[PDB]
């Protein structure tokens, strides 16, 4: 099944949400 993997953890090095908001502005 779909579990917590290293791609997820490696992704936790970046805060994409905050900067996607910078884009929506």
């Amino acid at each position, epitope marked *: 099944l779909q*579990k*917590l993997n*290293s791609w*997820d*953890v*490696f*992704g*936790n*090095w*970046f*805060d*994409l*949400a*905050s900067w996607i908001k910078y884009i929506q502005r």
Partner: antibody
Amino acid sequence: QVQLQESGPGLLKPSETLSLTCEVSGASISSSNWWNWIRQSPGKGLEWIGTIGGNSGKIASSPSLESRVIMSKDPSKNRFSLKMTSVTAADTAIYYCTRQEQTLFWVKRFDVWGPGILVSVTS
Amino acid sequence: AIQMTQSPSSLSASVGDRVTITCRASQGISSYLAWYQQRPGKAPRPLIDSASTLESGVPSRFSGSGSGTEFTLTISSLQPEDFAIYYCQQYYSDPFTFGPGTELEIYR
């Protein structure tokens, strides 16, 4: 020196919903950390329930409680929270908030714990 | 999930004895194994991580070893304050699981 402090009410009614919040006092919620909640009952034992990533916001729970557990994080107030529903009294336990540092590709131990919060479900 | 077991669930010794808890896992979880000490009342305290690397503030007498299925926590000389409950926990994969716990008490 990261310091975790649980909050929320320890007075609950059966088949309902509790809400706990962990104030972080050493690092930003929106960091390369993983904010976890841990459950400890004498018979049910020391059980991991949930986690959320400070940056990615990716959420993960225990197969048993994923169906009735919810994770959240408020960086503006530098806290993270969890809320479990259908609160059978068997869930009555101590709830700690912990965190995991991480390497490039995986998590680490629970290096820091909160004092623990006693939430009981009964009238 | 990953079945985490621990032996013995109970054990009694006295100051000066080399005591040893053992921790077993369903699968080969490499070195992703940590040990916590919980003196009843307060919250768990991490002692070992990566199976054989002890946290800050951990007395040197404590030791860990293992790299796969079965690991060992090893106190090289018991002390008045070591009479706590010891949990082993894997973080190799989720759901993250703990061992049953291992009791450690005094005499008389």
